[PDB]
Symmetry: C2
């Protein structure tokens, strides 16, 4: 397997060459009010380095991207028209928008492209074949997409959030054209490799969130790769119950207790549990915080955050790590009295990063909610935005949109 | 005869055993790259809880109407409220049942069976095409079915501000069928917007960013007779600089708005404040070569990407003098570290002023993305508006239909 990158494609030459780019242009839209208003253009900005490199090298660029999850064909609220306008402003050139995906208009505009021109097809998910489980359906669309750039063309995959599922514009079209990872996909792979296959040690993982069942895949995969896995958040009380401790009124996934016991028995001393807990008598911001030992949680209290002794032990652990992966809050950080555990670990990871650690923040858009606490993104080596795709990578699943890029080029 | 009664007023009338229809804002962002049904920011669910909790504790039979996204034509499984019902129940500490329809057989059966303190979430109200119809008769027919769920003795609480600027059945027409009240979020947002339009402590400083003048034109012209200062930054400042007769190189320029900006600069010469310097570059890229240039001397082959350090110092001093502050829109391309200084500096100045007693309001999805990326805690502002177009139209001076309807007399 050899995943070629954009620099490899540029080295081959793209002057006058049709290049199909799968971009991530799935920007949030206002759906309280009038249609077609982008509320965060960040993904458009992120798409520019790949597209600008191809434009300046003289490629004829055709872009496939989706917006939302259209139910059954064209949906005016999910037209890429506002995306084409915003993308052109950031690219410094007009971006044509086809009035269809692979119909009359797309074909005519693609045939007329000259060196450096950019054509955005309409929302690729308007076509029922794009997300079909039927291989023959996806192949039919993939062939039409490949015909837009021609048999001398190339394919660049630059949307990491869709590489974990077989979609025509992501997977099948890569079997039809010489294929390359774009700058975003290549960078996410390079980061995720440092968390799975090529780990600089000590490697510390920090996992939070509410349910063990949601994190089980990542825990089991990383337990054979990391030196420590710090367990916080709401899910930590299920592990504490598996230790034989009572957890009062805390969140508890009773059906996962025996699984947590198996993990603690199997991956001995990898998992690091809280030693103290900030508990309260009710789920309220104004509830009196009580710091209790993790083995002496009172029956009438619920745990809402990891305690200061836990933050202290976890911080010391993180200060020695070469590699840090963090996904999920340590407590109910919306309540300021129960935000200290999350803020404390964020500060520890940023501090370690400033002294040389490689730190990756998982979660993508979900983790941005935590950053309402005042946590600058620049404090970390890499913010992963790959969502479910990134998590499945960490779980050790083979991602079809990545695997296909490593195949030999079609002859 | 105009009085917008609030939730305290409704509770004083009594809601024990009473059906109360609440229009909530539960339009949370979802992941649409991968599998359906994954909420990526539950903030709006958290915000909805105070109104719902108050009604639950007072014994109300609570029926919640809310939308998710913009369904094209009927039910859409990606836009079901199922994950919202689960998350809302977790925050309420009680089961929230999802009806399998909006005003159909299941909604009717479950509303009729509700008991004191129960919360029923109807399926996505926009699964019914009548909800957003321009036709009053269609909206009123749906509104009658919604009101039937809580019965003739019921009440209506409007608690989603972002939809009050357009007529929708669950927001506007149903308020004509029942005793009607603003919920805690709508009452709070109105009180905030009143400070920004009517009476508020001076000096009153407004800071507007983002890319397009035309998006902010109505707000600028409305607030220019109210605020002591309006700072213009972001991409839209270059259209104002062009309006002054200066060239702006490769900078973003709304040529159709140049004449309008000139008129605004002439009329409100004492209110509008433009940047005095700009950070410019030859490419739209984080590692482009940056130059700090006077705002009235942008070189021809450069594009302006941030306000400059002299501008940051001047605007920071202005915000440090303000008793009331309204901010909407980034000052530059903060996604690039080299062009984040203007947005970081302004947001930090507003938080500092707020810590020293100023009343600060932030609006806009791009402003929110910026404060989250740049490490300014949301708790550092007096109020973060999530209202969107509705808040902007209120600030433009438009009375909004979803607010007007709540001020009508209660039924007799």
């Amino acid at each position: 397997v050899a995943v070629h990158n954009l620099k490899d494609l540029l080295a081959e030459g793209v002057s006058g060459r049709g290049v199909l780019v799968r971009s991530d242009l799935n920007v949030p839209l206002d759906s309280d009010g009038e249609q077609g208003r982008i509320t965060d253009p960040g993904r458009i900005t992120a798409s520019v380095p790949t597209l600008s490199a191809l434009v300046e090298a003289g490629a004829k660029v055709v872009v496939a991207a989706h917006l939302g999850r259209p139910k059954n064909g064209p949906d005016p609220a999910l037209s890429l028209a506002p995306v084409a306008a915003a993308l052109g402003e950031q690219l410094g050139r007009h971006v044509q928008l086809a009035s269809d995906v692979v119909g009359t208009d797309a074909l005519a505009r693609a045939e007329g492209l000259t060196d450096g021109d950019v054509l955005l097809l309409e929302n690729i998910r308007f076509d029922a074949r794009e997300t079909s489980k039927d291989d023959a359906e996806r192949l039919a669309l993939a062939r039409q997409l490949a015909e837009l750039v021609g048999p001398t063309g190339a394919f660049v995959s630059d949307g990491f959030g869709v590489v974990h599922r077989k979609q025509a514009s992501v997977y099948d079209v890569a079997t039809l054209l010489p294929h390359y990872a774009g700058t975003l996909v290549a960078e996410e792979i390079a980061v995720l490799e440092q968390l799975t296959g090529s780990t600089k040690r000590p490697y510390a993982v920090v996992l939070g969130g509410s349910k063990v069942s949601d994190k089980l895949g990542v825990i089991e995969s990383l337990a054979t790769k990391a030196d420590s896995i710090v367990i916080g958040g709401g899910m930590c009380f299920t592990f504490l119950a598996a230790q034989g401790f009572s957890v009062g009124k805390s969140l508890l996934e009773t059906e996962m207790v025996d699984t947590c016991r198996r993990l603690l028995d199997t991956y001995v001393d990898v998992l690091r549990l809280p030693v103290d807990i900030v508990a309260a008598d009710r789920f309220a911001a104004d509830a009196a915080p009580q710091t209790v030992p993790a083995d002496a949680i009172p029956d009438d209290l619920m745990g809402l955050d990891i305690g200061p002794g836990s933050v202290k032990r976890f911080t010391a652990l993180l200060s020695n790590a070469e590699t840090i992966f963090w996904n999920g809050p340590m407590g109910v950080f919306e309540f300021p009295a129960f935000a200290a555990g999350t803020k404390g670990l964020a500060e520890a990871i940023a501090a370690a990063t400033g002294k040389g650690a490689f730190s990756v923040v998982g979660g993508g858009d979900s983790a941005a909610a935590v950053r309402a606490l005042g946590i600058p993104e620049s404090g970390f080596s890499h913010i992963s935005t790959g969502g479910g795709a990134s998590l499945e990578y960490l779980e050790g699943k083979a991602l079809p949109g990545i695997e296909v890029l490593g195949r030999p080029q079609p002859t």
